[PDB]
């Protein structure tokens, strides 16, 4: 278990670390998207309420992320996919901050739990979407891969996107966006990245996540104890020992940090 470093405490300390460290890992949760104006999709009232009147077969919001229900009726998922699809919402200040840090080469990796795909829109290249995203779509059968744009037309017109390779008389020959559905396994890319990034990171920043769900929750405990860990979240996380606790709205705190960093970061305000 990691003990909190006694020599790293202040927001000035965090600012200096942000200036000196060159291989930063940023863990982001739902907190970096709350200002983007995205309707919730994990409860009621949420998107499930509007989908209940259209698709009376949905037992719960979680069903649209279940592979078995998806095979029976993929339509309610694709109506959800249309509402959250990339390009419809603007990335928050937190995304822009991470994107700039990647442009300057200071970003080792951004591990996120979000599926809103705002990282790609923001121009962040070194991303790892642990729960997947709409970045790519893949056929359920022949595993043919296409870009996000290749299925934008169908999803927008509420037509279930079909696979061009598989036979046209094939029922389940449909392009499913690479969101990690229930039961499915984490992409191989994640574990290779985490295995070696952990021995490469010099600074860990957590932004807007409670760190209660796997596999992102396990990351802070898997990196060497000497690496500084900064928390940027609305609530403290008692089950962890962060060196710096910046508590409050993520956009507010990031804005403050950008002000203190100056340079290209200040121009983000």
């Amino acid at each position: 278990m990691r003990k909190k470093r006694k020599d790293i405490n202040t927001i000035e300390d965090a600012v200096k670390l942000l200036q000196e460290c060159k291989k930063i890992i940023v863990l982001t949760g739902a907190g970096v998207s709350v200002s983007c104006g995205i309707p919730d999709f994990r409860s009621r009232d949420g998107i499930y309420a509007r989908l209940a009147v259209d698709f009376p077969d949905l037992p719960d919001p979680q069903a649209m992320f279940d592979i078995e229900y998806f095979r029976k009726d993929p339509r309610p998922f694709f109506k959800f996919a249309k509402e959250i699809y990339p390009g419809q919402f603007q990335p928050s200040l937190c995304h822009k901050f991470i994107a700039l840090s990647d442009k300057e080469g200071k970003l080792l990796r951004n591990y996120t739990q979000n599926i809103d795909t705002l990282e790609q829109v923001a121009g962040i290249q070194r991303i790892i979407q642990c729960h997947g995203s709409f970045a790519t779509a893949s056929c359920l059968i022949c595993k043919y891969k296409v870009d996000c744009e290749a299925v934008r037309g169908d999803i927008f017109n509420q037509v279930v996107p079909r696979c061009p390779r598989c036979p046209a008389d094939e029922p389940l020959a449909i392009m499913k966006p690479e969101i990690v559905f229930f039961g499915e396994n984490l992409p191989e890319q994640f574990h290779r990245a985490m295995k070696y990034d952990k021995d490469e990171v010099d600074l860990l920043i957590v932004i807007g996540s409670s760190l209660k769900v796997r596999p992102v929750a396990l990351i802070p405990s898997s990196i060497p104890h000497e690496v500084p860990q900064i928390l940027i979240n609305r609530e403290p996380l008692p089950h962890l020992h962060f060196d710096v606790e910046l508590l409050g709205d993520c956009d507010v705190i990031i804005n403050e940090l950008c002000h203190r960093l100056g340079g290209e970061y200040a121009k983000l305000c």
Partner: peptide, 21 residues
């Protein structure tokens, strides 16, 4: 510049913070 409360040794309370008891 933003307003904040410094709680020694390492806690900062900004706008929108959710700390209770």
């Amino acid at each position: 510049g933003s307003q904040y409360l410094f709680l020694p040794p390492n806690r900062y309370i900004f706008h929108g913070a959710e700390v209770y008891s």
